[PDB]
C-alpha cells in the first residue's frame, strides 16, 4: 500500500462489514458488531463511478465503415489501407492496456488513502482519551455506550465531556 | 500559557473557474490554464509571409487555362497556398475533361 493502511498497519479486511467499503467494529457492554462509515464510503463510490464514467463517456464515435475493397492492381493503397488499420490497432491496444494498468494502481491507492484518512479523523476526535493499540484500533479509557459510539460515527464526539473521566483512568493503568 | 497561536493554511480567492478530474467533475480551483484553442481571427492570411493565391470567380482550371472570366499574373508571383471559393464556376467553359486536375491542383498549391 502507498499510504500503508490497507495491508499495512490494518493487516486484514472485515467480511462482517457488508454494507460499505470502509467502516468500524465497535465493542462495549451493549455488545459488538460491524458498521460502515456512510460519509467516507459514499464519497469513494462517487469518485470511482466518475472514474469509470470518465473512461467510457469521453469515448464518443460516429457512424463509420472500416471495410475497403481493392483489386489486384491496387496493392500499394491496399497496403496503405492495411498500414492505417494496423497502426490504429497498435496505438489503441497500448493505450488501453496502460490505462487499465495505471488506473488500477491509482484505484487501490485511493482506497488506501480513504482508510488512512478515516483512521486519522477518529484519532483527531479522541486525542489522548484513547490509546492506539495497532491494527487501526482504539481503546477507550472511559465507558462509551451506544450513544457515545455512534457519536464518533456521527463525527460529534465530546472530548471535554469525558476528558477528566479518561484522564483519571489514564494515570492508573500505567501504574 | 499566553496564547500565542500559529496556524498553517492554504490560499483561496473568488475565482469561478471549474475543472474536471477523473474522480470529480466541476471542482472549483484558485487558478487554471486553458489548453484548447477555440478562437480564430476570421481572415485568410499570409502563411510563411507569402500571400496566398486567390481566384474567386474561377477555379484552378479556369485560371490556369485563361478563361475570359479570369485574371492572369504577368509579373513574377509567388504564393503559399491557393484559395478557391465554392462560388467559383467559370472554369472549363468549353465542356470536356481536364486530365489530372487534382494532381495539378496539388502541384500548384504552393
Amino acid at each position, epitope marked *: 500500500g502507498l499510504f500503508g493502511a490497507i495491508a499495512g498497519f490494518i493487516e486484514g479486511g472485515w467480511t462482517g462489514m457488508v454494507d460499505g467499503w470502509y467502516g468500524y467494529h465497535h465493542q462495549n457492554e451493549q455488545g459488538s458488531g460491524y458498521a460502515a462509515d456512510l460519509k467516507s464510503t459514499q464519497n469513494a463510490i*462517487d469518485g*470511482i*463511478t466518475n472514474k*469509470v*464514467n470518465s473512461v467510457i*463517456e469521453k469515448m464518443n464515435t460516429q457512424f463509420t465503415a472500416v471495410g475497403k475493397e481493392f483489386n489486384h492492381l491496387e496493392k500499394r493503397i491496399e497496403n496503405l489501407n492495411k498500414k492505417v488499420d494496423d497502426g490504429f490497432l497498435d496505438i489503441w491496444t497500448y493505450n488501453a492496456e496502460l490505462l487499465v494498468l495505471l488506473e488500477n494502481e491509482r484505484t487501490l491507492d485511493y482506497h488506501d488513502s480513504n482508510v488512512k484518512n478515516l483512521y486519522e479523523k477518529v484519532r483527531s476526535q479522541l486525542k489522548n482519551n484513547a490509546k492506539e493499540i495497532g491494527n487501526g484500533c482504539f481503546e477507550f479509557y472511559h465507558k462509551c455506550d451506544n450513544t457515545c459510539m455512534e457519536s464518533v460515527k456521527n463525527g460529534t464526539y465530546d472530548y471535554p465531556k469525558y476528558s477528566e473521566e479518561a484522564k483519571l483512568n489514564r494515570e492508573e493503568i500505567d501504574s | 500559557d499566553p496564547g500565542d497561536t500559529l496556524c498553517i493554511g492554504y490560499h483561496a480567492n473568488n475565482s469561478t473557474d471549474t475543472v474536471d478530474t477523473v474522480l*470529480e467533475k466541476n471542482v472549483t480551483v484558485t487558478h487554471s490554464v486553458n489548453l484548447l484553442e477555440d478562437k480564430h481571427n476570421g481572415k485568410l492570411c499570409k502563411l510563411r509571409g507569402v500571400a496566398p493565391l486567390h481566384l474567386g470567380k474561377c477555379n484552378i482550371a479556369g485560371w490556369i487555362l485563361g478563361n475570359p472570366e479570369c485574371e492572369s499574373l504577368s509579373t513574377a508571383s509567388s504564393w503559399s497556398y491557393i484559395v478557391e471559393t465554392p462560388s467559383s464556376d467559370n472554369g472549363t467553359c468549353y465542356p470536356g475533361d481536364f486530365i489530372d486536375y487534382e494532381e495539378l491542383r496539388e502541384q500548384l498549391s504552393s
Partner: nanobody
Amino acid sequence: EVQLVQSGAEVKKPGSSVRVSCKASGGTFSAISWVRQAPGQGLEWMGGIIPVFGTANYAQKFQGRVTITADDSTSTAYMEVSSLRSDDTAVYYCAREETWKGATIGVMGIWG
C-alpha cells in the same frame, strides 16, 4: 448527458411477474434507483443498485418481491417484481444518480 428510455406500458393479472427495461442513450455506470407512484398517492423509492459496489439495496416493503438488476455493456437497467397484486397497479420510474458534480449517489438526477 445520456438519455433514459424505459420500456413500454404493460398490463397483467395478479400472481404474475413483470420486468421493466431502462436503456441509456449512451454508456454510463451511474447508480440506478426505481421509484413508484400510485394513483393519488405520493412517490415511493423501491430499490437501488450500485454498479461499482455491486449489491442491490431495496426497501423493507419491497424486499423479497422486487429484483433490481443492470447490465454493463448495454447500460440498461432492469426492475423485476414477482407475485403481482392489485396494490402494485401504478406507474414506475427509472432514475440515475448524476449531477454536474458527478456520480452524486443519493439524488435521482436524470429521470426516465
